[PDB]
Prior knowledge:
part of a larger assembly, 3 chains, B: alpha+beta, transferase, Vps34, Vps15, Vps30, Vps38
Amino acid sequence: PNHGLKDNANVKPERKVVVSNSYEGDVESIEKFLSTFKILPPLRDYKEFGPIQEIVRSP
Amino acid sequence: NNITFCVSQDLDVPLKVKIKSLEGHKPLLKPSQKILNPELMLIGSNVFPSSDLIVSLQVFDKERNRNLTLPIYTPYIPFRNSRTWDYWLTLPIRIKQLTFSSHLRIILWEYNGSKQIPFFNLETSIFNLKDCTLKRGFESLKFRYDVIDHCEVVTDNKDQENLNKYFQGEFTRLPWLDEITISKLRKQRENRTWPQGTFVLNLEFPMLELPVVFIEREIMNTNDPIEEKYRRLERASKNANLDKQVKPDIKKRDYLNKIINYPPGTKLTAHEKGSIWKYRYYLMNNKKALTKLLQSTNLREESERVEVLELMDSWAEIDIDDALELLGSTFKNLSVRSYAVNRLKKASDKELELYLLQLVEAVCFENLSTFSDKSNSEFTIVDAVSPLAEFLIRRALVNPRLGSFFYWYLKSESEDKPYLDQILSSFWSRLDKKSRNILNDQVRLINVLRECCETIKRLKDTTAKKMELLVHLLETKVRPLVKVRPIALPLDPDVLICDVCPETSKVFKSSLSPLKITFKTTLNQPYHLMFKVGDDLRQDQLVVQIISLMNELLKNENVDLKLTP
Amino acid sequence: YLQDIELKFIAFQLLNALKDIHNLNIVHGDIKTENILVTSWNWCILTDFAAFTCYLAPERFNSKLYQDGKSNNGRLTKEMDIFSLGCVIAEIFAEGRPIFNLSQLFKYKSNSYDVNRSTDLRNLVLDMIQLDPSKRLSCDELLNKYRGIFFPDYFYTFIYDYFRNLVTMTNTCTNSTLEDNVKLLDETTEKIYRDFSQICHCLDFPLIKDGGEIGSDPPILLVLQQFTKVSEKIKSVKEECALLFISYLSHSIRSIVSTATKLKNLELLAVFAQFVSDENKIDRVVPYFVCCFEDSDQDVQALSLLTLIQVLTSVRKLNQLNENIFVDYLLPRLKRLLISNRQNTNYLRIVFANCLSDLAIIINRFQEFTFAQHCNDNSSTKYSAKLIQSVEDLTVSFLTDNDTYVKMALLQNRERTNDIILSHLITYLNDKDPALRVSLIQTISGISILLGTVTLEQYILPLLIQTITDSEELVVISVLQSLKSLFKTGLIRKKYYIDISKTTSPLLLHPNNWIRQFTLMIIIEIINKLSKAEVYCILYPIIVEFNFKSMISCCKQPVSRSVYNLLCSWSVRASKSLFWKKIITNHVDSFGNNRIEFITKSTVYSHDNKEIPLTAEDRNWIDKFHIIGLTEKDIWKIVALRGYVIRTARVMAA
Lengths: 59, 565, 654
């Protein structure tokens, strides 16, 4: 992990969420790897079945 | 530890693998030793040795079937304890260096009997098809004699344990129950299988982060051929093996001599350079063939430099006119500068006319000067402040006029190069006699005079008003000229100036605001002089010196073009 | 160097194809000059419309038909003029000097010329040379008249490869990075297609590629780099294979656009498979240049070592007398390139070069082959012999430099070099020099016995392969085994390997009799390897009756008869070393205790006498904590020596 902190001093890239399209090259395997993960779990929420209400509480 | 995706060159260091567990076949002593059995009369007949399983690791390269990685092997404990290690091991190939094409391999070498120790074989893949190196994660494998591999079921469960290491969304109570999952992974020991001709091993190589891999980058620089390649081939043809040196002669010697008669600044070809390399005899014979042959070869290794520098003092002394060709910065060779300085040791009156180019040489005189500067600083670390350069120093100390010329030449170079300012002091230290230094200070007052002219150019007034003011300033300057003693003249170093006529002076109407004054010399004759400030005259000055030198070249032809230098 | 027999014919063929295509484009008449065709790293000829002092190539038609500008005639030309100009240019390319002169034109007007310089080639050229329009040059007809039936197809595939090169050859016009991209891509595609392209003309089953792994899969596909060899230059070229296209692709591979460039240069080194003396020299010369070239990636050294290994696999006698001193200087250049950036691993290259030392001796044998070749003449046998002798005396210095570099890499500390010294010791047969190297390796073994004692084990195991004279050093090696008994368990197994290795070939009976007398007594350990080392005692006894009694004195087996019965004996010798390890822990505990009191109630036995007295009550309860059986009554006096050994292991600490 400390070596990962030294690698953080080297500071390569990464993203948790969606990132912009990377430049062409051998990284296309990593892009295809990004396309190898299922996505749009949240997109199914706003997609259909009308709108979404909010929580209203009481004493 | 953190997970993140990091490419090959992006990733830094070399791989390492921790290895722990196995699967007992139970067919022998638990170390896979000797193949135990009640039939052991045959075991004495088959001479079956008791082998203690140990391991070895090396990587099959790229599936290109080359060899890259390092074989490595650890110590021996009971393999009847099933040799549970979790022992880390490594080799010297980085991830940046690691080709995405690569594969791991392992050979389990036991310890059996007389000249006997067993051998088992296995292989696997380094990174993912997703480029993550073993997902930088824990795993389990299976292998037979050949063509066998690893799967994930309970190893897929273990891979989920690696998903605990792979940082799926997690919480603190989940961590305590991950201690309870240390109890669960403890419970995972229940596994059972009884295969044959093949075996299983539990091997975890969880890292912090998911690797990624690619090729290394590169640099295109200065669909084309290049310079260094031609150097490669030409240098490959440069063998010259049998050392016997013939001394042949033929009609081609004249043509070769003509080939050596080419201009100094020219760049010779390959065959011509070799023809000049075998021309060493005649090259030593002709004095004009020296510098050309010197540029016909490249000195890097001490091998060529040996015979070169050996023939440096051996060859006939070159013409001083052709000596200016090898005196350039194009050849930085120590022996070259040395021998040239020995040839330039004689300083004529034309050296004073060559002082302009000598200032250029002085500007180019610095190459790897850190050592020399440190050498001077070594002797300068004692008392507080308050090489052809030695030849230039001796020539400067010899004649006071030449020293004044060197100082005046240093005055211009002082602005461009800061080292020249201290080099002027080194020049003052180069001249022991202070007799010239007094007149040099009297001529140093001319800087204050130019400052006075600039002071006269500071205020803006009418043309006639500035003229009368220039007359008054010429009178105030005429007072100082009579007050101070005679100094060296700008026109010639030999002539000395006495005073200046105030009313005979003039003023330029140009934008540069030049000053024209007639100064009576020590020869009792008026001399008109035009000076300017706030501009660099080095261009027209060097051009004027070139005009004078060319005029000398014309005078050498015994014909005068009547050009005023 | 780039000029070759088939090369000129190839370039001329390309020019012929281009000219024929131009003739098929319904456009021609471009003036032919020697400056038209240009060459690149691909070593290919490329002609341009602008061919611009040099001797001009005249058109006979436009010349003879010219009067007052042909009565003010406009622009005119034909394919015939291009055929004659192309002819003269082709001859100029063939000889190296052209035929163009005023007297030559006058001779053309004289309808006669003296021919001095192949039959079919001369006729086909004379067809275009005699009369362009009249004699019917017919470039297409000559293209169909091409001699080689093989060469035509090979240069057809090379024409497709030339289209690939065109793909590589391809305000704003074209991008700068597009060149590098086109290069790397051209190379990768060049290899990927070089599989099947090799399969096309003159292939072999085994290779270093994937498709080559499939081809070698049929022919049985430790660690070494090997493939199909040259076999005396393709059996003296039975298929008549000469190709400079490989050298062209290598010269194009001289550049590098990625790390795929590694596989590119490797593919070039594979393309070196075709064996040609003069060509192999330049090909090998390129490799070292590549070595000293890129300090960026460490892979450069590896690829260079690969190409160098191929050069070692060339296996050809020296064509030029320069090959000796050129190799001697080649070693020095590699030595200069051996000095480089820190933390880089040159160990593999060291083991490789050391393994190639035998190939260096073979190079000396190649110098002897040059001497033998120069001895074929009269009054030049003794001269070549003396020359080879002097060159050998001069080669002694080169061998001294090599041994110096070897000792340097061995002294370097970077333990990977020590493992690289294994292959060095394997190939050391070429070096008959003194034991000084083994002494340096012995001091290295001591310094390893200090810190890297685990590696000292592996090195010592490999050190048993010495197989050298002065057997008096083997006694010191036995003492080094007693010193190997110190700590590392791997050193014990290694010493067992050395024990079997020494068991194979003996030296002195009596010394080894007492040696094995102690060692077999120390061989009673229950360790898996200790049993293996204990099994060598029977093999030792094979090499009689007096020795049988002397061995029967210390014999622990009453029922022992023979080797099988000795196996039953060892089967009855089964013991547990766990309580022995705990006993060693008690020994270290005693070392932590007070041994100061010598009271009761130095020779070899004095150590044991001092060992027993070390404890009284503690060792008793410790003896009561074990199995305490009659089979556990064994004292194992060797555990005292191993106790002082472990005391040295503890002397390596506080």
